[PDB]
Amino acid sequence: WSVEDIVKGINSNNLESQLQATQAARKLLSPIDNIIRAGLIPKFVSFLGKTDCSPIQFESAWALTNIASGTSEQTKAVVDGGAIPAFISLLASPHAHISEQAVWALGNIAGDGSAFRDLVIKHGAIDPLLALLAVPDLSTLACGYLRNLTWTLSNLCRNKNPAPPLDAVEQILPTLVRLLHHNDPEVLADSCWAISYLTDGPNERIEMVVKKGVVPQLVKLLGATELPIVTPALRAIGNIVTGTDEQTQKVIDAGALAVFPSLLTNPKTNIQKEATWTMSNITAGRQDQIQQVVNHGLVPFLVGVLSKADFKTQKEAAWAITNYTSGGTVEQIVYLVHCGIIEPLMNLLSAKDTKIIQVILDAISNIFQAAEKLGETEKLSIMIEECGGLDKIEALQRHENESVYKASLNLIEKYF
């Protein structure tokens, strides 16, 4: 059918003519702006309310879904046509397949931006969504249905500027925790992504998540074999340990450190980098937390990463080392030196990156302060020289950056 044929059929008072026409509009979309120009979107939306005719409900939801998956102008056309409250009403439809259409549709809309997300929320989509997931047995739900429900929830958690409303996140979180105990890889992935979004903010957002008791299950998922599961699990854990010392402690007490020998040696670059990033924030913690890194035998792994990884992962390793030397005890620093930290640290002093130079110089300064309390400054000096460190530190006196030439000047005058 062409546009005009459909318009006539949809605008008739014959229900089956309306159904036939909507079926035709479905297959065409399966000329969007000509459909919109004819004003067919409000017709589709009104057809969603024909409870006595589930076939035309299905056909309309489908049509509205296609148009919504297009450009922003078309998505807002679908939205300003009123698809959001209409779809929300269909979440509790006695027709399961219709309810599923509404879930998927609300998912795409909410995943466009914070504005549409909050619109979906403010029309009250969360309660009926959570009601659908409140069943005693999740296996009673279609696997596609369950996946769509999970994906929709994560979109309601996604995006900042602004972050989702606190009450919304509060209502959603316990359901996300339960979904973390599911066995479907895709359900687990999206649930972990949802958690990663919520922990990507101020400590208050982290505290909400951590207080729900989600950390032990995250740590378990960290050890999964499926990369699409490990990646957001690691991100979520990583976000959490950016917080307070006690929030970081709960990650440690969950046994997360035991997974990191495999994470730090994972062949996938991204996993290595974010695991090292995660370690850097743990060594930014207290002395007792640093000691836990030691006891798990992770220091040689960090030394390994600093030596044999891609440069940006090396930078994260340099952060882990400097954070280690800033909060660590003299004893912890001695052990660090025995793991052979000096040479790979010196090798990176020639990097063209100003930030890593500042970071490494800070580590060197901290290690010297430890050597001083040992009365071993000369030996540390001789050690740094014998691995090419002195030549690099001196060259850094003619560096353009103020923090760099000040620090390197200080080190030279002070120990060399």
Partner: peptide, 12 residues
């Protein structure tokens, strides 16, 4: 003293 916490956006 103590080390520096860096958020995900602070890393990248």
């Amino acid at each position: 003293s103590q080390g520096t916490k860096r958020s995900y956006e602070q890393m990248e």
